[PDB]
């Protein structure tokens, strides 16, 4: 009365897109 | 009757790779 | 009986940084 509980949720969603990763190597000689 | 809602489910799958880093500084000057 | 699935988890892991930049353009001529 009521019941026993139901099953668990699923799973949630992904998180939001990541940030940029860090500055690149240096260029080429001058 | 049904019984009381089921529990929050698991946390969200891993999200992708954010997007490549900016350019990395200018090569060695000659 | 049962009661009703519960609510979607929270968010999954945040999603990692982006691969490291291209390479920088080349160093001055002089």
Known sequence: PPG???PP???GPPA???PP???GPP???G
Chains 1, 2, 3 share one sequence.
């Open 4 to 6: 026993p509980p139901g």
């Open 9 to 11: 949720g699923p799973p």
């Open 16 to 18: 939001p897109p990541g």
């Open 21 to 23: 990763g860090p500055p």
């Open 27 to 29: 260029g080429p000689p």
